[PDB]
Each structure stands twice: as C-alpha cells, then as structure tokens.
Design a protein around this nucleic acid. Structure first.
Lengths: 208, 71, 100, 146, 191, 128, 76, 48, 126
RNA sequence: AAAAGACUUCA
RNA sequence: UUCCGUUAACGAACGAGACCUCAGCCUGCUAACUAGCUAUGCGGAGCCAUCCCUCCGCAGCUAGCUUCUUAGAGGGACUAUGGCCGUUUAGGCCACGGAAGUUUGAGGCAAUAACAGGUCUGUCAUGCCCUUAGAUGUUCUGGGCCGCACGCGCGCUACACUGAUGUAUUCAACGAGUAUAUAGCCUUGGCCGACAGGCCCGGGUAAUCUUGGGAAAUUUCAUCGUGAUGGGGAUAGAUCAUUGCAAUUGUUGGUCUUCAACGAGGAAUGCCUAGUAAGCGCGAGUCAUCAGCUCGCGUUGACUACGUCCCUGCCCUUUGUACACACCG
C-alpha cells in the first residue's frame, strides 16, 4: 500500500520531466541501485551528446529530488521500435507544422500519411476545432480500423495532447494510433482469433 | 434472448467443418480438442461455444445438405 | 392502524387517541379483593372451561387486566394442577382447565 | 453426574449456565465492590444498588465461563462483548457504555481468589485452579440443563 | 423417520376437502414436506402449476414483510411457531388443517383491479391464480392483527391465531373473510 | 498417558528456518524475495526463474506463497457540477509474492541479485 | 454526593454552585434563573434568549416552527 | 518584520490550492482522474 | 487415522469436517449440536438427516465452521455428512439428492454501484 | 377515444 | 444493423454483441507458519479418575495435506440432451442432466455526429479584455457561508410490543496505517478514570502487528402493558473532557437537568420484479478537528410481474407537414 504510493511518485518524475519536452518518450527499467532511464527518440543524440555537461545535468537533479544513494545512475539512447505505439514526437511533429502554418486540415492528413506507412491498419488523427477562429468543431480524418475504446485491453494505444497558442484561439490536438503488438510477433488484432488449416488430405494437418 | 450465434461464430463454424471433416465427429468433447489444433482462442468460453455449434451442424449435414456447407 | 388527519401550517396531524386505560393491576392484586376470591373463581377458571386450553394473552383482553397480575397466580394454581403453564422465549404460555 | 463433570462445561447452553454458575459465586468470600459504582457504573439503569439479584453475579459468571475456552483474552476483549459502543448517528442515543473499570475490577478479584493469572501481553489467562473451579461446579449444573 | 415441521405435526394427516385447491397446495414435497428454513426458486410462471409449496414457508415470508418494518425471517418463524401450537390447542386438531380451511374460505374467486379505460374506471375482475389466494388471505389477517397489537396488550401471534380460527369457520370476526366478500360484491355488481 | 519433555529437540528444521550445515553450521536461512510488479504475468514468470536457481544451488527450496490483494479502489465522478451517477471504476489489485528458499548461501544471494529476470518486476533480497 | 458553592465570594451574581445534583424543586427553579445569568452578563447566548431564537447552533436553514414561533404562511 | 503565527490545520498540496487534497498521489481527487486513466498505481494496468 | 473431509459448499462460510463413522455424537466447535443452536428450526435441519435415514449410530461428527456470524453456521454440516456415508453405501445415494443439497446460489452478494442508496435500490430522488 | 389552450428578439 | 432470406446492390469499417473486469463450480493443477486444516502427541484442563473420553495453544511437532484462505494457470455453458413450435432454419418454450440454461450472473467499454450542456474556480493549458503598489497580486489579523416570518430537494429519526429498555448471545467482510519526533501514523496489552478520556510499555511502513477485524441487525431471559409511554429524543441551561494558539452563531463527544412535535402523513410523487425490496452495521475518501454524506463492503432478504405498451421515452417502416427558430414550432 505504502509501496504503491512510492511507485506512484516514481512515475510522477517522468510526467514532470517529459511534460512539454521536444524529444520522444522515456520507458524506465530499474536495475539494482541505478536507473537505466531510456530515451526512445530519433533526436536522442542532442539530449545526450556524450561527455560534456549536458548528460550530467539530466541525471543528478532527478537523484537529489527522488531516489536512493549518493551515486551515479545511467542514461541510454534508443532508436524507436515503431514510432507509432508510444512517443511524444508524434504529437510534437504536428505542432511543428502549426507554427509557420500551412492548412491545419492538410497538416492533420500528413500525420496519417505516415503512421499507416509503418503498419498501423487503422489510425485516427483528430485536431482541435476553431478553424478561422470560429466556434469549436473538431475535425477527424481516419482510414482503417482503429480502436481506442470498445474492444480488448491490448490494442496498443498512442495518445497525447499539446496546445498551439495563436492570437485568436487555441488549437489543442490529440494524436491517436492503434498499431501492431510488440515487435517480435504476438499479433492478436481484435480479441477472438479465427484460423483454419490449409487442406484436408490429412496424416499431417495442425496449424495454430 | 442471450444465446444467438454471432457473425464471427457463423463464419468460423462452416470453415472448420469443410476442411477437417473426416477427423470431425458428432462428439462434443473430441471437437473441443480439434479447435485447439486449428486455432488459438484466448478464453475458455469461446472454445466451448464454437465446439457446440459445429457439432450441431455436423448432425444436420449427415441428415441432409446444409445451405452454406459443402463437403 | 388508522391513517391520520392532514397537515396545516402550524399544525401536525394525529387522528387516534387509543382505547384507554383499564386494568391498572398489581395494586389491585395485592389487596384482598383480587387476592382472596375474585381472580381464582371468576376470571382464571372460567376462560379455560369454555375452550379447554386457552393462551394467557387472549384471556388478558377478555378480562381486561394486564398479564403480570396473573403471573404469580398461574404459578400457585399450576402446582395444584388447576393450570398448566408452558414456556416460550417471548414468555407466552397457557391457562388450562383440568388435567384428566 | 460424576461422569458429566468434565464434558458438561462445554456442551451446555451458555445463557442458562451463567444463571446456574452465578449462585455458586454468592458462596465466595470476595464480591468486593469498593464504591466505584456510585456515579453511574454501567449503561443507564444499572448503577449498582439493584446489582445483588440482577447484575453482579451474572457479570462475574459470564467472564469466568468465557476465559476457560477463549483463554488469553484481556480487558479490551471483555469491554466490547458486554458493551455496544457503536458510533451513533448523533440522533440515536440509547445507552452509553462503560466497562473498562468494570472488567478490570472483577478480573482483579478473581486474581486474588487464584482463578486468574496474567499472561504478560496475551491478556488474562485461566489457571489450573481456575479450570478446576469451573469444571467442578459445572457438574452440578448439568442436571438441570439435561 | 420422525419428520419435523416443528417436530410436533404431520401434514399428510391434512385432508384438503376442495379437490381443486388440493392440487395447488402441495402438502408433499420430493421426499415429503417439512418446515425447515431454506431458499426456493419459485420463478413467476402463471396459468398452470408454477411452484412447489410449503404452507409454513409461505406464511413466514408474508408475515416478515407486510405489517411493515423491522422483521426478519428468524423473527417471523418464531411467531409462527408460537401461533401454530396455540391454534392446535384451541381447535384440538392439527393446526395445518385449520390454515388450509381458512385459505379456501378467504380466497375470493375474483378481483377488482383498477383499470382506467375510456371515460370511466371499470373493475371487471382479473385472475387470482391459486398462490395469490394464499397470500391475500394471510395479508388481510396480518393488518388486522397489527391494529390490535398497537394499542393493546396482545402479542401478534395470539392476534393472528384468533383470526385464523375465525376465518376457518366463516365467522366475520376475522378481518380477512369480511374483506373477501367485499371484493366480490363490487366486482360482480358493476359489470 | 504422560511424559513429554519438549522444545523442538529432535534436531532442527522448521517452516521458519531451513536448517543446513557447514558455513560454520548454517543457521541463517529466512530470506524473502518479494515481487512487486505492475503486470501479473511478469510477476509469475519471475517466480519460476527463482525456483530454477534454488534447484541448481545445492538444495531446492520451497515454491512461492503468493500472498493477499491490496486495494485502493476509487469511484469518484470527478466533477460534473451536480452529478450523482456514472462514476468510473478504476481498481488497483496488487500482489506481493514471497518465495522462500531452503538454503540462502552466500552463493545463492549473489546469483539472485546479479541475474534477475525482472523487467518491471522489482524483487528484493531482503532483511531478517 | 453533595453539591457545594466555592471560590472567592467576589464575582457578584450567580456562580453555579457546582452542577446542581441536589434536585427536586431547586433545580427546576434555577433552570429559569440560568437564562437570566446569560442575559445579565450580556453574552450572545443571552441576546439569543432575549430574541427568542434557539441558542445552541442548530440548523435554521429550515425548521424554526420550534425555534421561535409556529408555522406562519410566508416570510419576508 | 513578520508578526505572529499559529495556524496549523489542513496543509494543502502544491498541485492543488484546495483545502481537501491527497497524500496518496500528491494530487487532488479531480487531478486523480487523470492519474486513474494513466494507471500509475502499482499492480494496475488500464481498461478495467 | 480416520478423518476424511469432503467439501460440500453452499452459501458463504466453509466447514472443515473430520468425521469418523462410529458412536452417535454431533458436535460443532466441540459442543453438542442441538444445544448449540437451542430453540431454532434451523437446528432441526442438521438433525434431519440423522433422524430421517433411520441411522443414528453411523456418525461421530466433529465439525469446525470458522469465521463469520452465528446465523450461517447450520447449513454446511448436513451436506458433508450425506456425502461421506454415500461413498460407502450405494443405497443412500437417494438421500443426498432427495433431501435437497447444494446451492451456492452463484448470486452471492452483488456489486454496489453509485446512484444506489444501498447497492441496487436507487435513491429517493435521482 | 374528447381533458389538452398559450408560449419574447437576433435565430 | 442479432441473424436468415427475399433481394439493383456487392463486399467492408465503426457502434453493439463479442471483449475486458468481477462473482460462481473443481480434497483437480501448483504451493504456502508471514494463511489454514488434519493427523499426531499434549507438557496443560476436566471426567471415567484408567487407559480413555472431551476441551485447549496463529506451534507441541508432522504432514506424503490445500476444503476454506491466498493466487496463478485451466476446464466448466454451447440454451448440451430429448421433445414441441418455426420457412422446419436463425430461433423460442419446456423436461432432464447440471453449480449455473438467463448475452453465465453482475459491471466496464459504450460511436459517428449533435448541444452556444457544464467547467476559464483541477492544472505557470489558454485567446481577448481588465486589473496591477491606494492590487482584482500576495501575505497577516478578524468575521462569512451557521444568518431565517417561509417555499423546495436529498436525507436522518420516529410514531411502537414484527417494539423500546436492561442484562444476556458474541460472529465478520472490503479496506487502511503517509517519519508521522523522540515513539510519532494504526494502536493490543497493564494501570487509573462512572463517562468522555488519560498514562506507561510493546508490536506493526503490515498475509505476520493493529485484526479470530469477537461489528450491528438478529438471537435468549427479564421489565413493560398499551399509557405523548419509561416509545420519540426536539429545544434549552449548567458542568467536564478531547482537537486546535483559540471552539464562539453552543467544532465534536459525555454527564446532569429540560421530557417537544410525532398516534402511520394529504394534494401529489420516486424506486423496485429472489441474495432484489425493507431493516442493519462497517472501512475507505475529505481530514489538525468535524459526516445524518459519498464510495465500496459484508449481514438479514421478498409480495407481486417475466407480461404489455394504457401511462412514458426513443428506435424501424408507411403516411402528413404551411414546421427546420424544428411544438418552448
């Protein structure tokens, strides 16, 4: 119970640090007396950059705030094993088009124009209302499947948020993706799974 | 109430019978084993549902041709 | 049970007052009128004569005295074999006419 | 009766055991109240001038019976069973219970008698002598129960 | 065997004079009837036979509810247990027979449901499938018993018991029998 | 009848302490490996691996006793501003899974910590 | 039991005499006088007694048929 | 420069400036709804 | 020695029964059974099957039913006693079934959701 | 089936 | 929109069903003194006094034990089987088996799109506007929300004897104990106190200790005798403790005293179909203190319907529309 409170506080560290943060996601595994703390980003290069000072500024602060032992910890660069599944960059890329502009509707389409490319099977990008600074009337765009809510637990759901502050109006966002299952094979689309064998002249036949 | 066959059940039930037929039987218990061989269904109740429905169909086939099942 | 009147602003409704007191008892039991003759001859014997066994509580209503009045009396009589008392959790019991 | 003496302590209906057993406690040299009673000893009614038939001997008897079986039970265990002392809605009030001094005082008298010894953290413990006293008396009780 | 039902009364000694009533008051269960507290899916089938019956089980459950507040099954069993012996000693006859006699007498043929249709409220009567007759007779008996208890020194077991014997005799002293003929009178006349 | 002089007396081993000998006679065993994870599947997997280590060591120790559920269970309609229906059921089950060993050697201690199969399972080599 | 007044005689009126557990007529008589004590010192409790509004922090959100006068139609 | 103090009572979180508040989560119980969606409590992992 | 426990189950609370077929005692909590639940129709439920059966000396039952109120206690013991003797005797197969046994209900207390005043009885308004 | 009528501006 | 089938439409996706979660049945599977039960002894109690019998210990050991407990993994229901009815199908009804025949029961997900619904007072999310040292900042002190002639809602407690009082019976489940400082957060045990409470030790950041959660309804033996009753516990005053520096428009609790309306509630009106109604307690949440509250949980447990759309709301057809601001037209 008390241990559950402790776990929640550890999660809170990730929430505060990876609030805005113009990189992409952080899974953390905790090895004995050290935190691996793994950044899963394309631009994982800038945030580290090796030796300098940069890397030490990230680590140290977290330790004095919340963990155990006057010691170092660890920080790891990672690629991304599908940018779909989870990120932060997925939302931030859309934001980085709602700068200088380009049509808001066109920018929405471009995010989907990726995602399905890296598999997905369904995607829904949904961008905040108030085009031309009118009343809110959020706009969709979707191809394929896509279950955030309804079907089983293990849909593998990307969800985020962001804001874009104009002169007249906020333009929110919430990029959403329903992708594959953890890359190794373990695909299980929508919970009941049909499957047949191939052809029945038997003495050999079996499959799944 | 409750106990109507779904679309997911309807598609699968025909298919299993069609290309497993000699091995398939009227017997419920053995055809539960067959569904393990032919597919992975994640929960227990799914396996029992399909197995029961297929055996009922097997009886009908051996008493007159069934509309969407051809052997 | 009867229902009630109705409210008015000030007021509150009642409607029923009860039947009203009679059978004060225990005071009357101690004094000679009920201690000597009256309970034994009139009240106690006769109701079991009508229907051979009768519960105490039905007879309490007919005679219009409380139960505790005869609580002592039943014990005295039962030893004689005049009454037959029983048991119960809610203390219910019998007045009974004769054994034989 | 002699055969009965051991077994009967258990298998008899507790309520009527307490009524029988309480009479035996009248025999004892103790039953010391030292004027703790006076303000309002127990729930409502039972401040203890009525205690001689109604309250006292049956209070002692119930504690004595319970400790035999349930052994290793102290003051706080006794307080709750006799008591209510459940949180009122603030509108309810009915009785207000006591029991903390009450249980302590009677248990102390039993300790002087030699019925009870004190386990140092386990609460009050029934002695060998206490068990003898309970069981020997219970022999007599068996006759009216059965 | 020494079958229970309070371990004092048999129930195959009950002869049910009305043949039609006999078929819907099951006096025998799968091994024989008894009264012991239990549970019982009685569903809500209609028309045809639709439940098994124990007379005592129906009696205790109806008493627990109607004449509102407080009561329990254990509490209701206690008053029933007391009441049956009182009845038995006042009729000098098996008390199960007495209640069966009461139910048939105090069971109206017809009802007077409130149905509003067109410009008026009609009662043309509706069914009273025989378990409903059992319940209705007891319910009327209970409200009578309750009234007496409220302002007078009489325990509810005795109040109920007196009325039960009266009902099983056609005596309008009983609350239940009086009300039985009340319903029929209005229903038939205003057809 | 009579005559028992007791303690433990016929020599050692209890469900409390898995007696062993050598290491200046080992009377030290009472380690608890307590597995707290987000995901139950991972937690169960960890236990299997621990059982394997025990068998390898010298003496295979007893399997998991997985103990209790601990719940902080929250339904609050977060706000409506007058809403008294349609709250949301997010309940936290949590299990602590305790594996004891027959012998907690120095060898056992070091192998358990160094290769630990926990990804999100945090399993603790833990105090007497 | 007893019940005995105490303290330095200095304080003018009242005291309390120590929670009257003498009782019979004397407590009843003093009950009326006790309200007058609060009025006399000019405590807010005494002002509430003077007004006729019940003192001891009850809800008044509604209910006040008891509180100072019976149910009279509207309000203000 | 400062005066007189005494004024213990209900502390209050950083996250909420609100009289009621939570020790468990370091939140409020409207803030908690966000955390409930996130899981965040151990042995819990969404979609109930 | 002799102590065989066959788990009935039926309503909340579970009775672990070591039963030796021998002398005619009934116990629960090491105290005689009809006396334990004195003045009750539910005691006669337990006593039903050692009366109606024609068998008296055929069960020395020691029963311990542990941990929840006094009211529940009667029911379980009856069922176990039938089953134990049923293993031996093939003629008292029609004894367990016909004297009625085994409902867990499967509806044992249901979930309480908001809007409920109790759990399933919604509030007086709303 | 006869008890069923009204109801502001931008809109 | 569950399916079949007719079939100018074919084949998909979304919602739902399914699924997921949770409650059931397994001396099965796998375990466990940080959980138990047996068996064994039994120092220990009682009795025959003698083995035995019977009781007793969250240890007196053992276990080849896992029924409960605990939690992992399974199988278990598919309305199976049989018979009726039906395009003889999808199905629905019953009998039997069965723990369960009923989407397995109970929950959660519950959409596209709509609403000028509600929230700028969750958030250093936020456009615009104002304000900004004489602050609409912030901090400190004090007061407010508690104000009451009265309308309304959720509630609480009753009207009683299916009950109050007083002994007496004495049995839990879901949860939770944050360092909180010199034992302090939960508090057993010992003293002292009528009570409320105080105090001293000790265990417990916890399957272990608190907690056999020894809880209340209920259950039993009295009292009472139908009485505004000792039911009811209002309003009031005094007094003492607890928390807070401080308790007042009485924070709360108790003691003493006061001893209300209320004698079953009208016009109306909600909710409910067997672990549900009604009665009943508890833990958690807010929290220095304050719960008639909420949210879960146990416990005691039905009468009546398993039908229909009269009342009511909405869905699919056909039909009408002068409506589309959509009948508050």
């Amino acid at each position: 119970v008390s241990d559950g409170v402790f776990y929640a506080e550890l999660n809170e560290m990730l929430t505060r640090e990876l609030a805005e943060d113009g990189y992409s996601g952080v899974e953390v595994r905790v090895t004995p007396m050290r935190t691996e703390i793994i950044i899963r980003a394309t631009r994982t290069q800038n945030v580290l950059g090796e030796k300098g000072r940069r890397i030490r500024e990230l680590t140290s602060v977290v330790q004095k705030r919340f963990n155990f032992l006057e010691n170092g910890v660890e920080l790891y660069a990672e690629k991304v094993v599908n940018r779909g599944l989870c990120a932060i960059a997925q939302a931030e890329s859309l934001r980085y088009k709602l700068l200088g502009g380009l049509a808001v509707r066109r920018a929405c389409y471009g995010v989907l124009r990726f995602v399905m490319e890296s598999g997905a099977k369904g995607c829904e990008v949904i961008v905040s209302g108030k085009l031309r600074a009118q009343r809110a009337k959020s706009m969709k765009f979707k191809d394929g499947y896509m279950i955030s809510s309804g079907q089983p637990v293990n849909e593998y759901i990307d969800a985020a948020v962001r804001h874009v502050l104009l002169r007249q109006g906020v333009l929110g966002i919430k990029v959403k993706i329903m992708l594959d299952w953890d890359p190794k094979g373990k695909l299980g689309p929508t919970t009941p799974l049909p499957d047949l064998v191939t052809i029945h002249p038997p003495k050999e036949e079996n499959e799944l | 109430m409750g106990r109507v066959r779904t679309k997911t059940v309807k598609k699968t039930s025909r298919q299993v019978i069609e290309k497993y037929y000699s091995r398939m039987t009227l017997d419920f218990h053995t055809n539960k084993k067959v569904l393990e061989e032919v597919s992975i269904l994640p929960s227990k109740r799914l396996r029992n549902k399909v197995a029961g429905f297929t055996t009922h169909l097997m009886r009908r086939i051996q008493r007159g041709p069934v509309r969407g099942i051809s052997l | 049970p009867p229902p009630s009147s109705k409210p008015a602003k000030s007021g509150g409704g009642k409607q029923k007052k009860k039947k009203w007191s009679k059978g004060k008892q225990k005071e009357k039991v101690n004094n000679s009128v009920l201690f000597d003759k009256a309970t034994y001859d009139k009240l106690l014997s006769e109701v079991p004569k009508y229907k051979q066994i009768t519960p105490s509580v039905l007879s309490e209503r007919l005679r219009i005295n409380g139960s505790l009045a005869r609580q002592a009396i039943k014990d005295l009589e039962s030893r004689g074999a005049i009454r037959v008392v029983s048991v119960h959790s809610s203390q219910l019991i019998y007045t009974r006419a004769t054994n034989a | 009766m002699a055969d009965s003496t051991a077994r009967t302590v258990k298998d008899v209906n507790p309520h009527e055991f307490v009524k029988a057993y309480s009479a035996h406690l009248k025999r004892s040299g103790k039953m010391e109240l030292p004027e703790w009673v006076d303000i309002v000893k127990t729930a409502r009614f039972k401040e203890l001038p009525p205690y001689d038939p109604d309250w006292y001997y049956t209070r002692a008897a119930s504690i004595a019976r319970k400790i035999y079986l349930r052994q290793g039970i102290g003051v706080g265990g006794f307080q709750k069973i006799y008591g209510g002392r459940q949180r009122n809605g603030s509108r309810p009030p009915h009785f207000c219970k006591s029991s903390g001094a009450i249980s302590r005082n009677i248990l102390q008298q039993l300790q002087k008698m030699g019925i009870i010894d004190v386990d140092p953290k386990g609460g009050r413990l029934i002695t060998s002598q206490g068990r003898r006293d309970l069981d020997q008396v219970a022999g007599r009780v068996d006759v009216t129960i059965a | 065997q020494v079958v229970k039902l309070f371990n004092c009364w048999s129930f195959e000694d009950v002869q049910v004079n009305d043949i039609s009533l006999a078929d819907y008051l099951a006096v025998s269960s799968t091994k024989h009837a008894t009264y012991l507290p239990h549970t019982a899916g009685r569903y809500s089938a209609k028309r045809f036979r639709k439940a098994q019956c124990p007379l005592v089980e129906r009696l205790t459950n109806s008493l627990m509810m109607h004449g509102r507040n407080n009561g329990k099954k254990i509490m209701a069993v206690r008053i029933v247990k007391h009441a049956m012996e009182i009845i038995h000693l006042l009729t000098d006859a098996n008390p199960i027979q007495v209640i069966v006699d009461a139910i048939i007498n105090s069971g109206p043929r017809e009802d007077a449901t409130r149905i509003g249709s067109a410009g008026a409220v009609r009662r043309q009567a509706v069914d009273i499938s025989p378990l409903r007759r059992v319940n209705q007779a007891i319910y009327l008996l209970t409200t009578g018993a309750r009234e007496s208890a409220f302002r007078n020194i009489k325990t509810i077991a005795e109040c109920l018991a007196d009325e039960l014997i009266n009902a099983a005799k056609g005596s309008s002293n009983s609350y239940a029998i009086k009300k039985k003929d009340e319903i029929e009178r209005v229903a038939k006349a205003n057809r | 009848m009579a005559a028992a002089d007791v303690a433990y007396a016929p020599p050692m081993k209890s469900g409390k302490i898995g007696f062993e000998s050598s290491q200046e006679v080992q009377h030290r065993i009472r380690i608890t490996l307590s597995s707290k994870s987000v995901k139950n599947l991972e937690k169960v997997c960890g236990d299997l691996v621990k059982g394997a280590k025990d068998k390898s060591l010298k003496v295979k120790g007893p399997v998991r006793m997985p103990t209790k559920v601990l719940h902080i269970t929250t339904r609050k309609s977060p706000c409506g501003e007058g809403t008294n229906t349609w709250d949301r059921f997010e309940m936290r089950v949590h299990k602590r899974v305790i594996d004891l060993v027959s012998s907690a050697d120095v060898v056992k201690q070091i192998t358990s910590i160094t290769i630990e199969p926990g990804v999100e399972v945090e399993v603790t080599i833990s105090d007497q | 039991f007893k019940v005995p007044d105490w303290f330095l005689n200095r304080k003018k009126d009242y005291k309390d005499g120590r929670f009257s557990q003498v009782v019979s007529n004397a407590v009843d008589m003093k009950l009326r006088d006790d309200l007058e004590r609060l009025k006399k010192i000019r405590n807010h409790r005494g002002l509430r007694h003077y007004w006729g509004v019940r003192v001891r922090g009850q809800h008044t959100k509604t209910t006040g048929r008891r509180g100072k006068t019976v149910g009279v139609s509207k309000k203000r | 420069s400062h005066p007189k103090n005494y004024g213990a009572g209900s502390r209050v979180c950083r996250v909420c400036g609100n009289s009621h508040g939570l020790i468990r989560k370091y939140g409020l119980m409207c803030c908690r709804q966000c955390f409930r969606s996130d899981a965040k409590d151990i042995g819990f992992i969404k979609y109930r | 020695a002799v102590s065989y426990c066959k788990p009935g189950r039926g309503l909340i609370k579970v009775n672990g029964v070591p039963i030796e077929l021998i002398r005619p005692e009934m116990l629960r909590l090491k105290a005689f059974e009809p006396i334990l639940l004195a003045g009750r129709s539910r005691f006669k439920d337990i006593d039903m099957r050692i009366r109606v059966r024609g068998g008296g000396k055929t069960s020395q039952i020691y029963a311990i039913r542990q941990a929840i109120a006094k009211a529940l206690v009667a029911y379980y013991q009856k069922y176990v006693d039938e089953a134990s003797k049923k293993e031996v005797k093939d003629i008292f197969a029609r004894y367990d079934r016909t004297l009625l046994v085994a409902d867990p209900r499967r509806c044992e207390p249901k979930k309480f959701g908001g809007r409920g005043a109790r759990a399933r009885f919604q509030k007086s308004y709303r």
